[PDB]
Design a protein around this motif. Structure first.
Motif, mmCIF file in Angstrom:
data_model
loop_
_atom_site.group_PDB
_atom_site.id
_atom_site.type_symbol
_atom_site.label_atom_id
_atom_site.label_comp_id
_atom_site.label_asym_id
_atom_site.label_seq_id
_atom_site.Cartn_x
_atom_site.Cartn_y
_atom_site.Cartn_z
ATOM 1 N N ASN A 1 15.330 3.089 -1.973
ATOM 2 C CA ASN A 1 15.401 3.732 -3.280
ATOM 3 C C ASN A 1 14.889 2.903 -4.450
ATOM 4 O O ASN A 1 14.825 3.397 -5.574
ATOM 5 C CB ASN A 1 16.835 4.164 -3.563
ATOM 6 N N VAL A 2 14.521 1.652 -4.204
ATOM 7 C CA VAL A 2 13.950 0.842 -5.273
ATOM 8 C C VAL A 2 12.648 0.199 -4.818
ATOM 9 O O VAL A 2 12.636 -0.675 -3.955
ATOM 10 C CB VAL A 2 14.935 -0.239 -5.761
ATOM 11 N N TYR A 3 11.552 0.637 -5.421
ATOM 12 C CA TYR A 3 10.223 0.240 -4.984
ATOM 13 C C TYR A 3 9.241 0.402 -6.132
ATOM 14 O O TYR A 3 9.545 1.064 -7.124
ATOM 15 C CB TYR A 3 9.780 1.076 -3.782
ATOM 16 N N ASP A 4 8.069 -0.208 -6.005
ATOM 17 C CA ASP A 4 7.004 -0.004 -6.982
ATOM 18 C C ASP A 4 5.837 0.699 -6.338
ATOM 19 O O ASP A 4 5.440 0.354 -5.227
ATOM 20 C CB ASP A 4 6.531 -1.329 -7.576
ATOM 21 N N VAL A 5 5.277 1.684 -7.026
ATOM 22 C CA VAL A 5 4.032 2.238 -6.543
ATOM 23 C C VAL A 5 2.912 1.661 -7.377
ATOM 24 O O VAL A 5 2.688 2.070 -8.515
ATOM 25 C CB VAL A 5 4.000 3.768 -6.627
ATOM 26 N N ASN A 6 2.207 0.710 -6.780
ATOM 27 C CA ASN A 6 0.963 0.177 -7.303
ATOM 28 C C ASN A 6 0.201 -0.343 -6.105
ATOM 29 O O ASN A 6 0.800 -0.866 -5.163
ATOM 30 C CB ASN A 6 1.199 -0.936 -8.325
ATOM 31 N N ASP A 7 -1.114 -0.210 -6.125
ATOM 32 C CA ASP A 7 -1.894 -0.736 -5.024
ATOM 33 C C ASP A 7 -1.949 -2.232 -5.202
ATOM 34 O O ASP A 7 -2.336 -2.731 -6.261
ATOM 35 C CB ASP A 7 -3.296 -0.133 -4.981
ATOM 36 N N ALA B 1 0.842 -1.183 0.000
ATOM 37 C CA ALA B 1 0.000 0.000 0.000
ATOM 38 C C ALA B 1 0.879 1.234 0.000
ATOM 39 O O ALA B 1 1.570 1.528 0.980
ATOM 40 C CB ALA B 1 -0.936 -0.001 1.199
ATOM 41 N N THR B 2 0.858 1.951 -1.115
ATOM 42 C CA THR B 2 1.640 3.166 -1.245
ATOM 43 C C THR B 2 0.769 4.376 -0.992
ATOM 44 O O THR B 2 -0.314 4.491 -1.562
ATOM 45 C CB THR B 2 2.254 3.313 -2.645
ATOM 46 N N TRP B 3 1.226 5.288 -0.154
ATOM 47 C CA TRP B 3 0.510 6.539 -0.026
ATOM 48 C C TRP B 3 1.427 7.677 0.369
ATOM 49 O O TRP B 3 2.421 7.493 1.080
ATOM 50 C CB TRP B 3 -0.628 6.405 0.975
ATOM 51 N N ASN B 4 1.076 8.864 -0.104
ATOM 52 C CA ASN B 4 1.888 10.043 0.107
ATOM 53 C C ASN B 4 1.327 10.886 1.238
ATOM 54 O O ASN B 4 0.166 11.282 1.214
ATOM 55 C CB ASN B 4 1.974 10.852 -1.184
ATOM 56 N N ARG B 5 2.152 11.146 2.240
ATOM 57 C CA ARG B 5 1.706 11.917 3.386
ATOM 58 C C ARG B 5 2.636 13.083 3.685
ATOM 59 O O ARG B 5 3.776 12.886 4.111
ATOM 60 C CB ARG B 5 1.603 11.011 4.606
ATOM 61 N N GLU B 6 2.137 14.297 3.464
ATOM 62 C CA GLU B 6 2.842 15.523 3.833
ATOM 63 C C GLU B 6 4.259 15.630 3.252
ATOM 64 O O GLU B 6 5.216 15.860 3.994
ATOM 65 C CB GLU B 6 2.901 15.636 5.359
ATOM 66 N N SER B 7 4.377 15.448 1.936
ATOM 67 C CA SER B 7 5.664 15.479 1.223
ATOM 68 C C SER B 7 6.575 14.284 1.546
ATOM 69 O O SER B 7 7.663 14.168 0.982
ATOM 70 C CB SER B 7 6.420 16.783 1.505
ATOM 71 N N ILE B 8 6.140 13.407 2.450
ATOM 72 C CA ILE B 8 6.876 12.175 2.757
ATOM 73 C C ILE B 8 6.208 10.953 2.131
ATOM 74 O O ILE B 8 5.025 10.710 2.362
ATOM 75 C CB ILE B 8 6.983 11.945 4.269
#
Ligand SMILES: [Mg+2]
Ligand SMILES: [Mg+2]
Ligand SMILES: [Mg+2]
Ligand SMILES: [Mg+2]
Ligand SMILES: [Mg+2]
Ligand SMILES: [Mg+2]
Ligand SMILES: [Mg+2]
Ligand SMILES: [Mg+2]
Ligand SMILES: [Mg+2]
Ligand SMILES: [Mg+2]
Ligand SMILES: [Mg+2]
Ligand SMILES: [Mg+2]
Ligand SMILES: [Mg+2]
Ligand SMILES: [Mg+2]
Ligand SMILES: [Mg+2]
Ligand SMILES: [Mg+2]
Ligand SMILES: [Mg+2]
Ligand SMILES: [Mg+2]
Ligand SMILES: [Mg+2]
Ligand SMILES: [Mg+2]
Ligand SMILES: [Mg+2]
Ligand SMILES: [Mg+2]
Ligand SMILES: [Mg+2]
Ligand SMILES: [Mg+2]
Ligand SMILES: [Mg+2]
Ligand SMILES: [Mg+2]
Ligand SMILES: [Mg+2]
Ligand SMILES: [Mg+2]
Ligand SMILES: [Mg+2]
Ligand SMILES: [Mg+2]
Ligand SMILES: [Mg+2]
Ligand SMILES: [Mg+2]
Ligand SMILES: [Mg+2]
Ligand SMILES: [Mg+2]
Ligand SMILES: [Mg+2]
Ligand SMILES: [Mg+2]
Ligand SMILES: [Mg+2]
Ligand SMILES: [Mg+2]
Ligand SMILES: [Mg+2]
Ligand SMILES: [Mg+2]
Ligand SMILES: [Mg+2]
Ligand SMILES: [Mg+2]
Ligand SMILES: [Mg+2]
Ligand SMILES: [Mg+2]
Ligand SMILES: [Mg+2]
Ligand SMILES: [Mg+2]
Ligand SMILES: [Mg+2]
Ligand SMILES: [Mg+2]
Ligand SMILES: [Mg+2]
Ligand SMILES: [Mg+2]
Ligand SMILES: [Mg+2]
Ligand SMILES: [Mg+2]
Ligand SMILES: [Mg+2]
Ligand SMILES: [Mg+2]
Ligand SMILES: [Mg+2]
Ligand SMILES: [Mg+2]
Ligand SMILES: [Mg+2]
Ligand SMILES: [Mg+2]
Ligand SMILES: [Mg+2]
Ligand SMILES: [Mg+2]
Ligand SMILES: [Mg+2]
Ligand SMILES: [Mg+2]
Ligand SMILES: [Mg+2]
Ligand SMILES: [Mg+2]
Ligand SMILES: [Mg+2]
Ligand SMILES: [Mg+2]
Ligand SMILES: [Mg+2]
Ligand SMILES: [Mg+2]
Ligand SMILES: [Mg+2]
Lengths: 122, 393, 159, 46, 240
Positions: B240-246, B182-189
RNA sequence: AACUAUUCCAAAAGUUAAACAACUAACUUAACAUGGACUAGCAAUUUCGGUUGGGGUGACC
RNA sequence: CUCGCACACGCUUACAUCAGUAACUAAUAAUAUACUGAUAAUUAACAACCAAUAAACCAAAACAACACUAAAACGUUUAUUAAUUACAUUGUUAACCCAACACAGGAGUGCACCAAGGAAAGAUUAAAAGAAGUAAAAGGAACUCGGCAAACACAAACCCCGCCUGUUUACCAAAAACAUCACCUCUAGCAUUACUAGUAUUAGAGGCAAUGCCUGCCCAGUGACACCAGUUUAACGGCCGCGGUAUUCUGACCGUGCAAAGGUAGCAUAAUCACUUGUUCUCCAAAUAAGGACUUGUAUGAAUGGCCACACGAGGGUUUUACUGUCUCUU
RNA sequence: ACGAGCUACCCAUGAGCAGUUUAAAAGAACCAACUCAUCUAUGUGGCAAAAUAGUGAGAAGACUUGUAGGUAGAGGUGAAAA
RNA sequence: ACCAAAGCUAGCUCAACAUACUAAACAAAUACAAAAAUACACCAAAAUAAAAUAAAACAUUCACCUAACAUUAAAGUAUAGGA
């Protein structure tokens, strides 16, 4: 006072000492710790069909032996390359640059069984 | 600065190159000709070796930046084993969520109905405890690594036995070790909860939202606590190496699409290898959250919106003598801003299923003072356990 | 390495004694090799360089036995080669400087076959000669083909 | 107390102390091997 | 033969790391220091002795850290504190009253007005009042702390002359330093470490201390009560 | 003697005045480090003259 | 009558079956696990062999609830790559090893106290002396260097020395010797192999021996600091006489010589040169013993420590009870 | 040159300590295994180039012990007995 | 009459010569714990010989003493030496 003379063998040491008797390794240790065999390292016996052919393990006694001539590089050169070379020099088609038509091989690294570093057991 | 290696250890610097390599226009004579070291000759220098065909195992490790999935944005991952320094505070902040002491009252009513008990409760649960803690092994005193999963599974069975009375429980299936991303963006982090939990109880039909609208709107006014010196990212994995997909552990068209309960066991013998109760609470907050966020982006989609249909997931956790109960309601897919409506979490913390256990009779002055078995038993904790298992029906 | 009497009275104790040269770290400039080497030298070396009027001078003008260094001999092998070759890479941009320098040292110029064998240890020499002598033994097909062509051309020329 | 049992066998200790590899790692050892080779010993080393 | 030192680990960790005692033996195996060996088994906590250590080189400013817990250490006489800020944790030597759940400032910034000194505070020497109590004292700026680390020790800042500090070591010898060097303000932890009573010889052995020799040596001239004028002041200030 | 520390002269790298009065010298020294000394530590080599109403003490030569 | 079964280490065929043993091994035979020959044999699931590089983890084992101090062995997960394809290789006997022996000795671990292992006597006779045991009339230490050994006893008291548990001369000394908590001196202001990944509440070089009361006078010599002065004794070491005096023995006092200071407190016939079996009291019918006092010990004495004391001791002495073949006096 | 497979001291890494008494795993107490070696008698070319029988001391500790490593003779190591 | 007793071979010793001087035997295995086909490194190095002994002790000294130059003489001479 232990034993100096008797040869060192896997039967002699602790548990940690394992030394083969000289058979050849057929593979490597894999991920699970389990051992993996490589089908290529296991010798494949090449066995011809013997059934339809006539030769026997022994020879008739009255059958003659012969004058013993060890094969030399020279005799082999004369039975193979000499007829072809003489045939194509007499015809003027002889080419000192490429001898490969006569069976000469410039380098061994192309072919399956190489003679000098000796790629094959037997 | 005091540097942390020691010269004696660090791989010895190359021997000072032979003097014949300093003289211009001169070919040094080396032993490289005879294929072995000789004294009297100068040391040969060789090109870094290139075995024209590459071998999968024996090659040098590919530098990380060469990967297709490499990105320059550092992403902070939370996986199964990360400890949070401030457990529940951080968990909340990363999750944008308010904390409430007890369990939802729906669940408590489910728990206090005399209809919902098993045949003999105290008998059966005292037996499941005695079993997991003593009888399940050949040894005198079983370790935690065996007995924690055994007790959680024993209780799952005691609850499962109720499929006779409320035959909606057959709508569930249990799963082990699913990939969850589960990828999510929180407050520039950038945050990603990624990994496997132990055991996941899935349902065919979703769970009814447990908070009245008064609670949601009272959540709109709550101010998130902040720990100033400590960054909220503390305790996670910079990556530094990851996938953003739900990703939820299942492909499309899964018959049991709705996560119901997550189970978190702490089975490790040593103290230091287990979680502080608090860190465990954090763990199950963030993981419950990821589990929910997955669905929430499956049934609606990547757009960030407040939810007209709140997603609810549950979680339980264990020392094996100590239980952590959690219910999470996800109301929001936009966590970028701090100022909106916040998600909700109810945490019933530090619920003792039993005080202590004796596997051998404790004997004082040649008499038997304390017999074999559990000291103290809280039917309450199992009652809550039963409730959370019974939340669907 | 030696011995000594204390007080220099022959009647005193006799004592083992070793006298060590005083060493200095000094960087020296070679003209023909166009380089600065950081070398441990003695004050005697500096006086000999001074006396022979140049670094490169001191190295060409001194026999093997007097330098005593394998390094001195390699320096010499180097600039001796650079003189016999008239190596253009000395000063790539300025043939003026190049002819200028190659000029003053013209007394020591030796042929090329000699110049690469000067500073060599017997080991390095034996190795070098083993490498100049390195040949993959010639296939018997070649030799037999040449014997055959000889015989066939002598069968062709006799008729 | 009572003596003479001073030798307590180990193959590991034996081959580490007196083994072939041990003799060959130091120049002194190599000289041991060389002497025994000279004297014509049946076993050069353990 | 040759032993390798256990002291090789490159990356800093708050996690306790395993270590090998060697009773008094150098790397050759001979005894160098007598009377050492066989204590309790010990793990080692890496201590960051550079108190001002900006997390990222991106933001240089004076930063502030929280004290999480204060723990016993087997390796040194002082008690040590786990200290976290930003994304990073480190072990630092704990000042006397430092307690869990605390706030501690680390600053390189001097100013004309000095500072009101708390305990965990690390400041450059020039930034302190002239009577202050200091520990963990750098010698050359950027070096890291060496002096005054022992349990319950404190030096005192004596004066400031010519952009330079002069401090008083626990041995009551004076030390001259640039005023740009960092120190922590206070007395080091565990002040009663002096008054601890080892009850039994066994207890000494637990500390890895083997008994003295049994040999009887007659006292020499070195023995007696020597009264020496206190030594001249050490200056780490390098004059042009 | 060596070695380990001390102290000094020399070696080696330097640096200043253009020095003073009337009508060349002086000082400097980071780590190594040489030659010659100094003071200690730790040590090295070697020896226990004979007579004697046994030897020793005393005495004697 | 009871050291049994297994594993590790170590031994290497000494193991198994059949046959043989005139002689060779067994310290004799019978015969055979050990001598001879021939022929066989231990089969992997147990065991050995059996991935690296990053990243989060401050949170002991003790039935672990939670703690104690001496601060503690033992891994999860995430990421990146890890040849992918039945059967690899090696240890599997024994009654065994180290002790020159088929040695009453030395040998780690897990389970057992028997269900498993074993045989003290070649056959006689029933002399002495010797060894090991059981019993003993009356007496109960009279034995003896000593209650050594033994006992139907298995208790109490007092001294000396060391505080204590510990350590030591493997094979003649286990102690009062050494160490030791404590107390004291000295020497050090500091960084990548010891000390120490430490920093003067620290670390080395020693002395002395816990605790309690104490630790007096001396820097002239010899050291060592201070490179000379000067400082230092919890540094090496030192700490006195002769004559005249109170009616009388003594000598507060007096004289004078010499010293760097002139042995202070305490203790004392001592584990303390000799004199010595000092003198006296207690203990015994009787004591060169033991304890207590006196005590110049002209050779005690204060961290080369002096004096008391608790507890402790296979230390060395003494008393009482009890017990006894130690002894009368042996059977 | 060779020796630390015995022994002295270390370094890694393992293993043992049952019952009883105690608020207590306190270099406490009783007493096994275990470790030592007090006193006596045997034995004295012995079962043994240091043992046997009894008797003793310690027995959660400065404890015992396995395995692998280290320090070497102008040396090592030493709770000093040369 | 037992125990015994007698052989003359195996080979060796010392020189000569001599080419020249690490024999023989190598299929595999051999420097993992030598005789174990197969995985990213390290590798390597030098410092005066000493003393026993002679000097009737012992302190400077003490031929030869693992460094090619032989032979006939010069000559045990010149020299050197606690002379
Ligand atoms: Mg042998
Ligand atoms: Mg083996
Ligand atoms: Mg074995
Ligand atoms: Mg397989
Ligand atoms: Mg022997
Ligand atoms: Mg320490
Ligand atoms: Mg501490
Ligand atoms: Mg001491
Ligand atoms: Mg002492
Ligand atoms: Mg002497
Ligand atoms: Mg001599
Ligand atoms: Mg005499
Ligand atoms: Mg005489
Ligand atoms: Mg006489
Ligand atoms: Mg006479
Ligand atoms: Mg006389
Ligand atoms: Mg044998
Ligand atoms: Mg047999
Ligand atoms: Mg027989
Ligand atoms: Mg078996
Ligand atoms: Mg008999
Ligand atoms: Mg009789
Ligand atoms: Mg009798
Ligand atoms: Mg009796
Ligand atoms: Mg009687
Ligand atoms: Mg009597
Ligand atoms: Mg009598
Ligand atoms: Mg007795
Ligand atoms: Mg009695
Ligand atoms: Mg009695
Ligand atoms: Mg004692
Ligand atoms: Mg000892
Ligand atoms: Mg003895
Ligand atoms: Mg002993
Ligand atoms: Mg004793
Ligand atoms: Mg004894
Ligand atoms: Mg003592
Ligand atoms: Mg005091
Ligand atoms: Mg005292
Ligand atoms: Mg005094
Ligand atoms: Mg003096
Ligand atoms: Mg004086
Ligand atoms: Mg008295
Ligand atoms: Mg007397
Ligand atoms: Mg006296
Ligand atoms: Mg004294
Ligand atoms: Mg005295
Ligand atoms: Mg006491
Ligand atoms: Mg005793
Ligand atoms: Mg006693
Ligand atoms: Mg004792
Ligand atoms: Mg009778
Ligand atoms: Mg050993
Ligand atoms: Mg017990
Ligand atoms: Mg005890
Ligand atoms: Mg006994
Ligand atoms: Mg008896
Ligand atoms: Mg016993
Ligand atoms: Mg006892
Ligand atoms: Mg006792
Ligand atoms: Mg070893
Ligand atoms: Mg000597
Ligand atoms: Mg010695
Ligand atoms: Mg002594
Ligand atoms: Mg002589
Ligand atoms: Mg003579
Ligand atoms: Mg003599
Ligand atoms: Mg000689
Ligand atoms: Mg002369």
């Amino acid at each position: 006072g232990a034993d100096r003379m008797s040869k060192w063998t896997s039967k002699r040491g602790p548990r940690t000492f394992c030394k083969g008797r000289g058979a050849k390794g057929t593979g490597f240790h894999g991920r699970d710790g389990k051992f993996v065999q490589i089908k290529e390292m296991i010798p494949e016996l090449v066995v011809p069909e013997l059934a339809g052919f006539k030769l026997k393990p022994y020879v008739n006694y009255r059958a003659p032996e012969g004058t013993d001539t060890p094969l030399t590089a020279k005799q082999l050169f004369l039975e193979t390359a000499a007829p072809a070379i003489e045939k194509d020099f007499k015809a003027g088609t002889f080419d000192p640059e490429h001898l490969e038509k006569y069976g000469f091989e410039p380098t061994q690294e192309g072919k399956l069984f190489q003679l000098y570093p000796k790629n094959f057991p037997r | 600065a005091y540097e942390w290696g020691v010269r004696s250890t660090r791989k010895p610097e190359p021997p000072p190159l032979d003097r014949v390599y300093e003289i211009p226009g001169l070919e040094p004579i080396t032993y490289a000709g005879k294929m072995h070291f000789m004294p009297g000759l100068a040391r040969p220098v060789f090109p870094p070796w290139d075995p024209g065909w590459t071998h999968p195992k024996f090659r040098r490790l590919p530098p990380l930046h060469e990967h297709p999935l490499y990105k320059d944005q550092a992403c902070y991952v939370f996986h199964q084993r990360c400890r949070l320094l401030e457990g529940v505070k951080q968990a909340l902040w990363l999750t944008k969520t308010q904390l409430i002491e007890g369990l939802p009252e729906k669940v408590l009513r489910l728990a206090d109905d005399p209809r919902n008990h098993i045949e003999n409760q105290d008998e059966r649960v005292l037996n499941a405890i005695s079993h997991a803690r003593l009888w399940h092994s050949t040894e005198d005193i079983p370790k935690r690594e065996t007995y924690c999963p055994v007790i959680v599974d024993s209780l799952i069975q005691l609850c499962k036995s109720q499929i006779l009375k409320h035959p909606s429980l057959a709508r569930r299936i249990c799963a082990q070790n699913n990939t969850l991303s589960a990828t999510w963006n929180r407050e520039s982090i950038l945050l990603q909860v990624h990994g496997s939990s132990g055991a996941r109880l899935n349902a065919k039909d979703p769970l009814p939202p447990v908070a009245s609208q008064e609670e949601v709107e009272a959540t709109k006014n709550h101010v998130l606590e902040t720990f100033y010196p400590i960054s909220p990212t503390m305790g996670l994995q910079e990556c530094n190496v990851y996938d953003v997909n739900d990703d939820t552990g299942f492909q499309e068209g899964y018959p049991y699409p709705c996560p119901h309960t997550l189970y978190f066991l702490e089975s490790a013998n040593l103290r230091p290898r287990r979680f502080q109760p608090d860190q465990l609470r954090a763990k199950m907050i963030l993981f419950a959250f990821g589990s929910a966020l997955a669905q929430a982006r499956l049934l609606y989609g990547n757009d960030s919106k407040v939810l007209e249909q709140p997603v609810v997931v549950q979680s339980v956790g264990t020392d094996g003598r100590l239980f952590q109960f959690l219910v999470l309601q996800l109301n929001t897919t936009d966590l970028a801003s701090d100022e909106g409506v916040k998600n909700l979490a109810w945490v019933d913390s530090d619920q003792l299923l039993y005080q202590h256990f004796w596997c051998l009779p404790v004997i004082k002055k040649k008499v038997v003072v304390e017999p074999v078995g559990p000291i103290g038993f809280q039917p309450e904790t199992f009652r809550k356990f039963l409730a959370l298992y019974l939340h669907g029906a | 390495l030696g011995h000594r009497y204390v007080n220099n009275d022959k009647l005193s104790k006799r004592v083992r004694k070793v006298w060590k040269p005083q060493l200095f770290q000094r960087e020296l400039y070679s003209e023909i090799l166009d380089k600065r080497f950081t070398v441990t030298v003695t004050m005697r070396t500096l006086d000999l360089i001074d006396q022979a009027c140049g670094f490169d001078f001191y190295i060409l003008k001194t026999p093997k036995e007097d330098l005593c260094s394998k390094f001195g001999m390699d320096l010499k092998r180097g600039m001796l080669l650079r003189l016999a070759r008239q190596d253009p890479q000395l000063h790539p941009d300025d043939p003026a400087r190049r002819a200028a320098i190659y000029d003053r040292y013209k007394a020591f110029v030796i042929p090329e076959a000699e110049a690469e064998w000067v500073g060599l240890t017997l080991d390095e020499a034996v190795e070098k000669q083993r490498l100049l002598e390195e040949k993959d033994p010639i296939p018997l097909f070649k030799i037999f083909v040449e014997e055959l062509l000889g015989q066939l051309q002598q069968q062709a020329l006799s008729e | 107390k009572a003596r003479g049992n001073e030798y307590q066998p180990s193959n590991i200790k034996r081959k580490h102390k007196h083994g072939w590899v041990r003799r060959l790692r130091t120049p002194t050892g190599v000289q041991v091997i060389l002497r025994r080779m000279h004297k014509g010993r049946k076993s050069l080393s353990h | 033969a040759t032993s390798v030192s256990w002291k090789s680990r490159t990356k800093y960790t708050v996690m306790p790391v395993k270590m090998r005692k060697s009773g008094g033996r150098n790397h050759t195996g001979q005894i160098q220091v007598h009377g050492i060996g066989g204590g309790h088994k010990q793990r080692y906590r890496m201590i960051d002795f550079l108190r001002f250590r900006p997390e990222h080189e991106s933001k240089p400013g004076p930063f502030e850290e929280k004290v999480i817990a204060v723990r016993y250490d087997p390796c040194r006489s002082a008690d040590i504190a786990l200290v976290a800020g930003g994304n990073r944790k480190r072990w630092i030597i704990a000042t006397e009253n430092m307690k869990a759940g605390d706030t501690v400032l680390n600053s390189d910034h001097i100013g004309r007005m000095a500072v009101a000194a708390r305990e965990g505070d690390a400041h450059p020497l020039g930034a302190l009042p002239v009577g202050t109590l200091i520990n963990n004292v750098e010698s050359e700026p950027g070096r890291g702390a060496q002096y005054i680390r022992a349990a319950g020790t404190c030096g005192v800042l004596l004066r400031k002359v010519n952009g330079t500090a002069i401090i008083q070591l626990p041995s009551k010898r004076q030390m001259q330093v640039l005023e740009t060097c960092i120190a922590t303000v206070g007395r080091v932890s565990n002040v009663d470490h002096n008054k601890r009573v080892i009850g039994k010889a066994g207890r000494n052995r637990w500390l890895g201390k083997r008994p003295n020799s049994g040999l009887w040596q007659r006292k020499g001239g070195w023995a007696g009560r020597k009264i020496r004028p206190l030594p001249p002041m050490k200056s780490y200030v390098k004059l042009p």
